[PDB]
Amino acid sequence: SMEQVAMELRLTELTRLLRSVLDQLQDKDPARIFAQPVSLKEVPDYLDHIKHPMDFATMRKRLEAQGYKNLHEFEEDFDLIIDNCMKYNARDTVFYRAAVRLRDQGGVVLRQARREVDSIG
């Protein structure tokens, strides 16, 4: 149908915008601490602690399959990155501190993303 196509163009355009959002958030992680999944070879107990691991590469796979239906879903995954790290790592660690700085800097980007998603519909 023509309606299905229209919906699909909407999803494509959201994917476009979320790709730009993802790039901007990932620039706030210049250390690349959140770039890839925590290695279960190197942290073998990880899944005993963290039930829903997340990282920027995993988000990018989902994004490119157009697997984010709305901004809420994409924010859920970004918050997992931060929140997982802040639980597994102690406050005095470079990992925890990286997550705090990513959350704080990311907030700005996400604030305007929400306005754009609502504005453009």
Side-chain angles (χ1 to χ4, degrees), residues 1-2 4-6 8 11-15 17-40 42-60 62-68 70-110 112-119 121:
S1 77
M2 199 43 236
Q4 291 298 322
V5 172
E8 294 163 1
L11 176 62
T12 296
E13 284 305 292
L14 175 69
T15 304
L17 181 159
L18 295 183
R19 194 179 302 112
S20 172
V21 177
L22 180 65
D23 290 346
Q24 285 176 71
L25 297 171
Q26 188 151 26
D27 292 332
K28 310 316 172 142
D29 172 35
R32 297 191 75 84
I33 289 162
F34 304 105
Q36 291 291 333
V38 170
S39 173
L40 306 175
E42 303 168 359
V43 188
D45 76 359
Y46 190 66
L47 297 189
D48 293 341
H49 292 268
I50 298 302
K51 298 296 166 183
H52 295 98
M54 192 47 55
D55 65 275
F56 287 128
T58 301
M59 293 190 59
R60 194 175 293 282
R62 177 160 169 196
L63 177 61
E64 288 316 329
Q66 298 186 351
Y68 294 114
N70 53 53
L71 185 53
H72 183 69
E73 292 187 343
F74 174 100
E75 293 173 317
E76 289 196 331
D77 270 354
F78 178 65
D79 284 335
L80 279 177
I81 294 178
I82 300 317
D83 292 336
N84 288 346
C85 184
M86 295 174 71
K87 289 168 188 79
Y88 190 80
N89 302 108
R91 220 158 23 253
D92 71 330
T93 61
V94 61
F95 307 107
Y96 184 113
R97 292 164 174 279
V100 169
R101 289 164 62 85
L102 177 64
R103 191 200 57 188
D104 286 350
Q105 297 196 273
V108 181
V109 171
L110 291 169
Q112 200 51 40
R114 162 57 62 209
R115 293 190 67 84
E116 283 174 4
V117 166
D118 293 358
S119 194

